[PDB]
Write a protein that binds this DNA or RNA. Structure first.
Ligand SMILES: [Mg+2]
Lengths: 165, 368, 344, 255, 63
DNA sequence: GCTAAGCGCACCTAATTTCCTGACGGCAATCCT
RNA sequence: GUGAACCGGAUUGCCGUCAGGAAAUUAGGUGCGCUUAGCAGUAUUCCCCACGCUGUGGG
């Protein structure tokens, strides 16, 4: 989809200081700090004007902050419930595995403006296991499409089929 | 004449009600998960509230023979009480039996401890149990009982034990989407060891939510249940209002001391019950300005204005009192000037609703 | 000229009860019985209980018909407690009733043309409320939806009418059953081994007397003799569209028009203006009229967008034309000067 | 001529109708499981009620020993997939003993659903069994509207005080009896920006936007809370914000 | 609490203690339903005590 | 009246253990003698 | 009006009650934004109204 791949490319082309000012902006909105809003305008407004399929404001802001925090490379076929879910096969099935499973289970019951913290702990579990690649494009178009039930359905049984291999 | 209480109560992270697996009660409302508090939990907390000791008058126990034996310093009578109860219909130490406490004490002592016949003594005990419906908690919560017709003798007849409930309590549903949270607890061993491991590891489950609480009292049915003594009915209504405002369910309160007080109470007087939970069909999302109680009160005021400008009767005006501590949260912030008597004191609110009920003051009715 | 009349029977629930039910267990048949469709037509004409009896049954009953089952609805049992007495006493009558859930039927009655025309006219004008066998089952689709036509046999009539998809991606039955009154063929011709008995020929209707009839089923295959239809509508609601663009030609004309009566001046600080801001997004994309647009300068449009992003402003954005929303706009505009690098 | 009333009513979590095993009554529609309120439940809830009790009225509306009552109701099919839930209760012994717990220690069933409720009246037969009393028939139709607007099924309500009001009523005077249950062959999926009742009313609006393309309609929402059709299109003849003026407009249309 | 205090020596004493004597348990957490936003001329602790005092006065007057 | 090129790094390591509760409470009528 | 019409599954209820995730840890090693410039020594100053066309009512 156009408008999202170039968003991921521009996020990946961001330099270290820009990622730092995005990192400090994590945990709050963008109305209290200027350079966060200037950066969101610079990375959104021309790409919003150029394409009709630009992502929604808050999901784009969430993915920008999470990419600044974690910095995983973009790679096709590396979405969240595959990588976590293959991670969920190497744990103790009676105690630890239900706890990490509930950590991933929490994600299905948030709106878009508190969603970054359970995602942050999930991506921290990913970082603790040396995971370098994530389908950032896949994550953001399934996150912008969060209003429907079938998308969460295919999310979930993708986790299931990653678990049963 | 229906008295309607709509309360908005924000709670600290707590687990007031739990299911089999120790999870907070959740229900689907408007297509989304909502934190739920059971109506039976609220009814128990109201009945066991500190504003109810002078008004509590009912016991719902299966150990009735224990109660009857307890009024006997030396008169050992427990097997005969159990036998007369077993022939009364209970099959065992029995099924659950609800009636008054002074009634069971005095009347069962003077009936079953008497050396007399056996079947008609069981009939007398059954009449005493069925007719003992003069307790305002029994009048509010309601009761009917059916004994086992197999173990009961054919010579024992039971009168009508159906007490119609004058109180309807809804399950307290959250105004926003449910947020189930997990608390990872350990239990440290107080003696040291060579391993340094906890004595027990577990996961508690808790949730913090803004609950909408709904109560409905039927005044005609309440004065029919408690008979003509309307002073006790006014005392029951005032004790209910004070207990509902000032008591929380006793869940895991030792570990989650969440004793927050409600920020908004609407007491409305109308002949038809209204559920304002449809105000919160759309979940309440937080914003930068205002808070959750303010947003929920605004949504509730929007729906109250819509209902009054919608379902309205000229023959029966709708009228209600709005509560906020020292007028902290107004109801109609923008346009809905419907609450005529925004009241900033609980005793003033109780006095106002008692005056609308009739010529009753709170001090005068606190004697029955 | 049209010798066939068509009935469309679709609802949330339906129940055409069989012969083995007037006890407390009151089951249903898989297909609409002849007495059921005959009663539906009798209500559509609107004659009395005994007016059906007085020479009205065999005129509608010699019409050898077929019933075409589009999709098989499942059998749902409802737990019905009749109150009996609520002369009266506390006794509760117990019952379980069978319903067909999510099934669609087409009934083709073949007869002489004038009866078919009268039946279609009465179907368009039901003088009494008609339903799907039980009064608590009103139809979800019009019974007079499919127009009548002329067909030689029942098979041609039942294969001519298409099968209507309710939505775009639903599983359709590859095989489609059809149940018809048994055509005797030539004189004589005792019924074949597959001919089943069915007590659904009405001859009196109060009390109901039913006569047996011979019932035979064929199978139709969709895609060669029964063809699907179009969707002819939308299913989901999908509320209206936000996210007005900023490159279409209809945008710039309204944006430049709003910069005229405002004299290229800002509205909160009265600086020279260079852009425009929206007050509500009830109309957007290209449809914009110049009464909900505010001409704003560069340094305050950015402040406005900084303030409306996460305030839950939904549709009605910040107006610079009311005192309530203004006093914090200046407090915001204090610090966009403070921290922005002027150096695209 | 037929008066058709399509009511959308969102009920708070409760159990209004119970089957043999205590579950909420359940039907099957749109290829998914729906919550159901039986027709006779709504019939008896509307009947025997002082809200409605205030030749013989209400014998013609709901029959009693060949009356063929003018008013009948459909089973309340939910607009979405049913969500039945277990509630676990205990009943305390409230006498200090060596153990704890005394009651049934059982489980009840409850569900919250947005019901589409269909009502149909024939006017001509309602006049016919009223012996030509047209004014009495108009008054009893207004009484039906008043009652069914504010009467709920008096099922298990002492423990589940569900007294919600309908958020939308569509009244038409069309030719053939049609139910809009086919509007909700789609179960209503909830989005973040819209609620369940708004989406259900929108599905109804998008379905009455059809049929006319290939009669009139009075739309009632409390103080125009939910407008039928979020446009200026000629889809609802009169957007009405109050129930009393809705009843007045319907009555003055009829007579 | 002694949780990672060797790496985070956070031994800060309370900035305000309200000890009340009453029959029923009440709590002032609902004061902080609205999160405290820090302004330049005031303090987080000062604003926290101010909001607590507002709710305490409201509860005392209305309850 | 307001310029323009060229230039923007990658390598190393990412951890271990052990503990994870028990007993108690589970209803009855009334729907052909 | 069609195995159909008339037709609730009714009410009685706290899951509750015990608990520190705990102890351990440098983000380091490398770095020029930089090369050009009168806010003014004039030759059409963009003009609407007006002088025999160089004064005059100002956008
Ligand atoms: Mg400005």
């Amino acid at each position: 989809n156009r408008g999202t791949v170039d968003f991921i490319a521009s996020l990946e082309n961001l330099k270290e200081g820009d990622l730092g000012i995005l990192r400090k902006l994590r945990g709050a909105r963008l109305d209290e700090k200027l350079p966060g809003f200037d950066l969101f305008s610079a990375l959104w407004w021309p790409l919003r004007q150029k394409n009709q399929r630009a992502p929604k404001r808050e999901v784009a802001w969430l993915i920008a902050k999470l990419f600044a925090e974690f910095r995983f490379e973009q790679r096709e076929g590396a979405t969240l419930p595959i990588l976590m879910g293959g991670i969920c096969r190497k744990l103790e099935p009676k105690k630890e595995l239900p706890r990490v499973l509930a950590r991933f289970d929490q994600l299905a019951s948030l709106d878009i403006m508190q969603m970054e913290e359970p995602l942050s702990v999930i991506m921290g579990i990913l970082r603790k296991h040396q995971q370098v690649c994530l389908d950032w494009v896949g994550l953001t178009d399934v996150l912008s499409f969060w209003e429907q039930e079938p998308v969460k359905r295919e999310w979930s049984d993708s986790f299931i089929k990653a678990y049963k291999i | 004449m229906l008295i309607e209480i709509h309360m908005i109560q924000n709670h600290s992270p707590a687990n007031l009600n739990r299911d089999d697996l120790g999870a907070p009660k959740t229900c689907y409302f408007g297509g989304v998960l909502r934190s739920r508090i059971s109506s039976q939990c609220i009814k128990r907390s109201i009945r066991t509230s500190n504003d109810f000791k002078a008004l509590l008058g009912g016991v719902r126990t299966r150990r009735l023979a224990d109660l009857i034996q307890q009024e006997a310093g030396e008169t050992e009578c427990w097997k005969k009480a159990q036998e007369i109860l077993n022939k009364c219909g209970f099959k065992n130490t029995k099924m659950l039996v609800f009636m008054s406490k002074d009634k069971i004490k005095d009347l069962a002592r003077i009936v079953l401890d008497n050396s007399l016949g056996l079947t008609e003594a069981a009939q007398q005990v059954a009449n005493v149990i069925a007719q003992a419906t003069l307790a305002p908690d029994i009048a509010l919560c309601g009761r009917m009982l059916e004994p086992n017709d197999k173990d009961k003798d054919k010579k024992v007849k039971w009168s009508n034990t159906t007490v119609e409930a004058a109180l309807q309590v809804a399950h307290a549903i959250s105004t926003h989407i449910a947020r189930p949270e997990i608390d990872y607890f350990v239990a440290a061993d107080d003696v040291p060891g060579e391993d340094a491991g906890a004595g027990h590891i577990g996961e508690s489950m808790f949730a913090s939510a803004c609950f909408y609480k709904y109560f409905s009292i039927d005044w005609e049915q309440l004065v029919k249940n408690l008979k003509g003594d309307t002073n006790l009915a006014a005392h029951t209504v005032g004790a209910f209002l004070l207990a509902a405002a000032k008591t929380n369910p006793s869940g895991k309160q030792n570990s989650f001391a969440a004793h927050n007080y409600p920020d908004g109470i609407l007491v409305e007087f109308k002949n038809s019950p209204i559920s304002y939970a449809n105000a919160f069909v759309r979940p309440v999302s937080v914003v930068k300005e205002s808070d959750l109680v303010e947003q929920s009160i605004g949504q509730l005021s929007n729906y109250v204005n819509d209902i009054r400008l919608g379902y309205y009767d000229e023959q029966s005006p709708v009228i209600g009192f709005w509560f906020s501590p020292n007028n902290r949260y107004p109801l109609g912030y923008k346009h809905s000037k419907l609450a005529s008597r925004n009241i900033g004191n609980l005793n003033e609110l109780v006095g106002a609703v008692l005056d609308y009920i009739g010529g009753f003051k709170w001090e005068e009715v606190q004697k029955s | 000229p049209p010798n066939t009349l068509f009935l469309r029977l679709e609802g949330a629930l339906q129940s055409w009860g069989s012969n083995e039910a007037k006890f407390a267990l009151r089951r249903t048949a898989d297909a609409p019985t002849k007495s059921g469709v005959l009663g539906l037509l009798c209500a559509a004409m609107g004659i009395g209980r005994a007016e059906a009896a007085d020479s009205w049954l065999p005129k509608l009953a010699n019409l050898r018909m077929g019933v075409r089952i589009d999709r098989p609805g499942i059998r749902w049992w409802d737990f019905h407690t009749v109150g009996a007495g609520q002369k009266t006493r506390a006794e509760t009558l117990l019952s379980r009733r069978e319903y067909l859930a999510d099934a669609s039927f087409l009934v083709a009655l073949q007869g002489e043309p004038e009866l078919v025309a009268k039946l279609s006219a009465a179907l368009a004008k039901p003088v009494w409320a008609i339903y799907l066998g039980r009064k608590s089952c009103p139809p979800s689709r019009p019974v007079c939806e499919h127009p009548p036509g002329f067909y030689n046999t029942l098979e041609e009539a039942l294969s001519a009418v298409p099968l209507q998809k309710r939505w775009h991606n639903e599983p359709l039955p590859q095989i489609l059953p059809c149940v018809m009154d048994w055509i005797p063929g030539y004189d004589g011709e005792h019924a074949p081994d597959d001919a089943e008995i069915h007590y659904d020929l009405p001859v009196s209707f109060q009390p109901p007397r039913h006569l047996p009839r011979f019932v035979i089923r064929r199978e139709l295959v969709v895609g060669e003799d029964v063809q699907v239809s179009r969707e002819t509508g939308t299913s989901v609601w999908r509320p209206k569209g936000t996210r007005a663009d900023y490159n279409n030609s209809e945008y710039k004309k309204v944006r430049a028009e709003r910069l005229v009566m405002d004299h290229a001046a800002c509205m909160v600080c009265k600086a020279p203006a260079t852009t425009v801001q929206h007050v509500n997004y009830r109309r957007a994309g290209g449809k914009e009229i110049p009464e909900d647009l505010r001409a704003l300068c560069r340094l305050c449009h950015d402040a406005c967008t900084m303030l409306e992003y996460g305030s839950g402003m939904t549709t009605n954005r910040i107006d610079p034309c009311d005192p309530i929303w203004r006093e914090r706009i200046l407090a915001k505009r204090k610090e966009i000067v403070e921290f922005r690098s002027r150096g695209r």
